């Protein structure tokens, strides 16, 4: 397949007045690992992040071309961006290539910078958004992560438990996908602090 | 009526095209002479300072190994038309694998003057070369008008030089004698001492290619004056 040429895995999960996002740290060609500190989560503001799994060329291209538009936006505008609007910006950016598509399936997670209610979204490679209220996944291990988040997720979760949930899903999912792993990184973002952790994961 | 090249006079004239002719007399004078042994070209350089290297004043140039040009007028027009001639002479070789005649080089270079670029070319050219038809000398004018000539003078002192060529010319001459006559005429239309840096000279014979003279060959003809 196409997106399995580089691999990847991204997850997002909400709490009560908080949200999380996680990704694996591997870069490799078809079956060979090249690098173990590859970036797949990109900040798009304070209390707002985006994650990208797919073809690495398209990951970097989409991130750079989106930061372009975001910087011009918040310069013309006098305000930081809402997540609902970043979702539509990405949808437009991807649907402009409806027949030349970027091979990415982004995942967004953030807090509105006035009322700080959490937000999580998912998009396809041509920009159909998907605003769930429990969790979203994208990558090569999507079924394996659906199976974990369906069983472990609970409605109201403080950050100490949300971290455990989004970590125990990612670890046990990427431990059954051959082209995803070699580390897992997690971001927890609240009104007052953004916490960031790398986890003890298998490197096989 | 005077300004604009799309405007006729009541008598049917194009004064801008004539004022392009008048820009030739502001250039130094050049002479070209036919002979059955070859063609000669002889010019004044008009050095304005001893500091400038006079070899950077291109008033006679090679178009090909069998055609050489001499010009008078604007430098930019000359650069354009000389590049045109050089390119055409080689497109002809690429296609047909033979040497373009001087008549056809002149014909093809005159066709750009037939384009109103928005301004007439302020430059006249003499084309000297050797063809299947022998040595040939041609003269192109800003109007795109071209004609075969046996001897022609262009530039500042073209009138007096032409009024001398009509006496010293006959259709039996040699090349060493025509080279002497050209420099004798050139001596008389200069307020500067003729020397081996104030002039260029070139020839194109049948069995020899274009050849610009040197300081040695020049002084060895300046001495017999």
């Amino acid at each position: 397949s196409i997106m399995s040429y580089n691999g990847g895995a991204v997850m997002a999960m909400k709490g009560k007045n908080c949200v999380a996002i996680a990704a694996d740290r591997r870069f490799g060609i078809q079956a060979q690992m090249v690098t173990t500190d590859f970036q797949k989560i990109f900040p798009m503001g304070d209390r707002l992040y985006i994650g990208l799994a797919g073809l690495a060329t398209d990951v970097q291209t989409v991130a750079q071309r989106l930061k372009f538009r975001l910087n011009l936006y918040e310069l013309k505008e006098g305000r930081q961006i809402k997540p609902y609007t970043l979702m539509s910006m990405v949808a437009n950016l991807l649907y402009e290539k409806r027949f030349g598509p970027y091979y990415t399936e982004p995942v967004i997670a953030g807090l509105d910078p006035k009322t700080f209610k959490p937000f999580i979204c998912s998009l396809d490679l041509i920009g159909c958004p998907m605003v769930t209220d429990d969790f979203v996944v994208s990558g090569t291990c999507a079924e394996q992560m659906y199976g974990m988040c369906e069983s472990l997720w609970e409605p109201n979760m403080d950050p100490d438990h949300l971290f455990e949930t989004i970590s125990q899903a990612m670890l046990n999912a990427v431990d059954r996908d051959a082209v995803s792993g070699m580390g897992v990184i997690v971001h927890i973002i609240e009104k007052d602090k953004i916490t960031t952790r790398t986890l003890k994961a298998r490197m096989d | 009526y005077d300004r604009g090249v799309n405007t006729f006079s009541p008598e049917g004239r194009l004064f801008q095209v004539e004022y392009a002719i008048e820009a030739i007399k502001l250039g130094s004078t050049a002479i070209g002479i036919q002979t059955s042994e070859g063609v000669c070209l002889a010019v004044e350089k008009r050095i304005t300072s001893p500091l400038m290297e006079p070899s950077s004043i291109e008033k006679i140039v090679e178009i090909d190994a069998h055609i050489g040009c001499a010009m008078s007028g604007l430098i930019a027009d000359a650069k354009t038309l000389i590049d045109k001639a050089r390119v055409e002479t080689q497109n002809h070789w690429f296609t047909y694998n033979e040497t373009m005649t001087v008549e056809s080089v002149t014909q093809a270079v005159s066709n750009l003057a037939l384009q109103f670029m928005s301004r007439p070319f302020g430059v006249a050219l003499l084309f000297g070369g050797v063809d299947e038809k022998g040595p040939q000398l041609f003269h192109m004018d800003p109007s795109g008008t071209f004609v075969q000539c046996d001897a022609r003078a262009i530039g500042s002192a073209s009138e007096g030089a032409q009024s001398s060529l009509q006496e010293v010319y006959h259709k039996s001459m040699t090349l060493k004698e025509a080279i002497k006559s050209s420099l004798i005429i050139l001596k008389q239309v200069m307020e500067e001492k003729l020397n081996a840096t104030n002039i260029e000279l070139a020839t194109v014979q049948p069995g020899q290619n274009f050849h610009m003279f040197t300081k040695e060959e020049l002084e060895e003809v300046i001495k017999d004056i």
């Binding site: - | 005077d2 300004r3 604009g4 801008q16 004022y19 392009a20 002719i21 008048e22 820009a23 030739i24 007399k25 502001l26 300072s49 001893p50 500091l51 400038m52 290297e53 070899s55 950077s56 004043i57 430098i75 930019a76 650069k79 670029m117 928005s118 301004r119 007439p120 302020g122």
Partner: protein
């Protein structure tokens, strides 16, 4: 037939091309001297203003390793011509791996200027350029370009306010004797710039190029030494021997 259009005159002139040279007769003086293995040009300074960083008043500008350039006239047209020459200096190594020669890029700049004298709706570049540099075979070169698209080669030249007076100086002084060493090729430029200068030495900026070195702009610690040597050699000869 008069001003305001590039058409012609009854005499056979183009006055919008002369009025651009009249802008080159308005900038700061810039001289250039060709030697054997050193080539030196110098430019008058632009009257610093007590609160200005002079890092951005660059009159001398390199185009490649072997070629350099100094200009007089409009300051903004210079930047565009210099960038468009710097691009061609690399496109010429792309098209053929050989480096560029001085006459090639001088011809290119002159064609670029010629191109702006052909149409209305385009204004000529109101600059001249002294384009000094090196070659393979190590032949020193100096050229001068005007707005009309004309380029010649020179042993020494000047452009700007005072070129008509520095030309007489270099006529009276430029010989094979004053290019014996590098220090004599630089002293000639210093003395020539003195003929229009503020009688100072801080109002001078000289650069040099050797067959080995790259471009090397001088600091006032050496300009002062050369100027003091020249003041001493003139206090001894013109005064103490006549």
């Amino acid at each position: 037939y008069d001003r305001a259009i590039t058409v012609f005159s009854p005499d056979g002139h183009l006055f919008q091309v002369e009025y651009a040279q009249e802008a080159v007769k308005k900038g700061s003086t810039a001289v250039g001297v060709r030697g054997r293995d050193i080539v030196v040009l110098g430019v008058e300074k632009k009257s610093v203003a007590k609160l200005q960083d002079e890092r951005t008043v660059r009159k001398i500008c390199a185009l490649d390793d072997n070629v350099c350039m100094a200009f007089a006239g409009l300051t903004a047209d210079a930047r565009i011509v210099i960038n468009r020459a710097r691009v061609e200096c690399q496109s010429h190594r792309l098209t053929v791996e050989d480096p560029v020669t001085v006459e090639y890029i001088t011809r290119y700049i002159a064609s670029l200027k010629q191109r702006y004298t052909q149409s209305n709706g385009r204004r000529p570049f109101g600059i001249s350029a002294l384009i000094v540099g090196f070659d393979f075979d190590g032949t020193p070169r100096l050229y001068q370009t005007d707005p009309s698209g004309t380029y010649h080669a020179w042993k020494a030249n000047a452009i700007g306010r005072g070129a008509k007076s520095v030309r007489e100086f270099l006529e009276k002084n430029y010989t094979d004797e004053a290019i014996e060493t590098d220090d004599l090729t630089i002293k000639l430029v210093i003395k020539a710039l003195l003929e229009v200068v503020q009688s100072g030495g801080k109002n001078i900026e000289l650069a040099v190029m050797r067959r080995d070195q790259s471009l090397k702009i001088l600091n006032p610690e050496e300009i002062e030494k050369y100027v003091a040597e020249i003041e001493k050699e003139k206090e001894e000869n013109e005064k103490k021997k006549q």
